[PDB]
């Protein structure tokens, strides 16, 4: 049997994966998800993508590990610049709009948006930064808008010679090539077990059994024991309660506030009574200090 905490909330994946509008790449929308149960099997039903792309974990192994916090970054980029969404990437988007630490442990989902982000006249509500003095630091965004200067003389607020605007509007058309179609991109970043975790799948704490010698791994504690009801008054927020031997005897449950008692499974020694070997081979077996009912 095993332990899991008291999480009953459901993580809101519906609002992030589809909201009829997406933030620009230069200003990517970031949401924090925690204190809920995340069902990643329903993600396929929200966005029309092909397959996951995870680096630190596997797409089929996201419903077992329990993480502290989840970060979701959503934006829309060009078709050919999806390749720039990868660890240690180099490019305009890589160092000017979105930078990712090289130790990224998460997933990236990108899928086409030609039917919503393209207009016959031409979409212009999405912009990306073109010029920047320095490459972007990991997990850093830029919102400030100004006139970039590439000359000795100051720009003086007029876009004259040696004065540029580092905000280029994306050109999206329904007749454009595949590498130029607008694509919605969502990057999910996970935090490992550094603080009490809050996001993982809803598997019961093995439906707590009673009156049986049982193996267990309770919250990293490996052992065996017999579990029975309890008559002790554990105060509101105790998790483990020990004895004179400094070993646990009464226990709570992180999936339902219940008070339970622990005992060691019965065990004993075996003795054999025999006459002389030269006399006969018959033997008698005795179990030391055990009532003649269990055996």
């Amino acid at each position: 049997i095993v332990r899991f905490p008291n999480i009953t909330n459901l993580c809101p994946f519906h609002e992030v994966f589809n909201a009829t509008t997406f933030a620009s790449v230069y200003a990517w929308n970031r949401k924090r998800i925690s204190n809920c149960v995340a069902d990643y099997s329903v993600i396929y039903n929200f966005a029309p993508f092909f397959a996951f792309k995870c680096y630190g974990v596997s797409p089929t192994k996201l419903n077992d590990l329990c993480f502290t916090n989840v970060y979701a970054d959503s934006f829309v980029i060009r078709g050919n610049e999806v390749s720039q969404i990868a660890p240690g990437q180099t490019g305009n988007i890589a160092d000017y709009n979105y930078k990712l630490p090289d130790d990224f442990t998460g997933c990236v989902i990108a899928w086409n948006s030609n039917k919503l982000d393209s207009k016959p006249s031409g979409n212009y509500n999405y912009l990306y930064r073109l010029f920047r003095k320095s490459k972007l630091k990991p997990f850093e965004r830029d919102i400030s808008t100004e006139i970039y200067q590439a000359g000795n003389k100051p720009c003086n607020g007029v876009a004259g010679p040696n004065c540029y605007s580092p905000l280029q509007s994306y050109g999206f058309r329904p007749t454009y090539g595949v590498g130029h179609q607008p694509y919605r991109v969502v990057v999910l970043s996970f935090e490992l077990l550094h603080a009490p975790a809050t996001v993982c799948g809803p598997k019961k704490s093995t439906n707590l059994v009673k009156n049986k010698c049982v193996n267990f791994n309770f919250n990293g504690l490996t052992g065996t024991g017999v579990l029975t009801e309890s008559n002790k008054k554990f105060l509101p927020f105790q998790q483990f309660g020990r004895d004179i031997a400094d070993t646990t005897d009464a226990v709570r449950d992180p999936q339902t506030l219940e008070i339970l008692d622990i005992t060691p499974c019965s065990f004993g020694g075996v003795s054999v009574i025999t006459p002389g070997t030269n006399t006969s081979n018959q033997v008698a077996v005795l179990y030391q200090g055990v009532n003649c009912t269990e055996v």
Partner: nanobody
Amino acid sequence: QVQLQESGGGLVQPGGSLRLSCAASGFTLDDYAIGWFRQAPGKEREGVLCISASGGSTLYADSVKGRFTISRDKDKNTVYLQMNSLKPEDTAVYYCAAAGRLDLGSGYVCYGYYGTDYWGKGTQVTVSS
């Protein structure tokens, strides 16, 4: 998400004053050029006045130069219009509009006229004459 609603108007005598304001809710564009438009019954709607968003470079039409005063406040994301010495030809259906700034030649330039992304429901301003 983005909505443009206007308030104010009515019927006033010639030479009077009125205040018109259109509130922008849910706007997310960093750089944009919002404009105000009017259309008298039987005439095409035309641009009237507009200012820049970054610093407030004011622009006016010849027919409403001086008589029309505008101010943009970023606290409420609402633009306020001041009209004084109203004249009979000013009777029209007044609208508020919002659109993003054009990006050409690597610069920040605000453009009005046509090609506006968003529009309001409009209001009626009448002069007794």
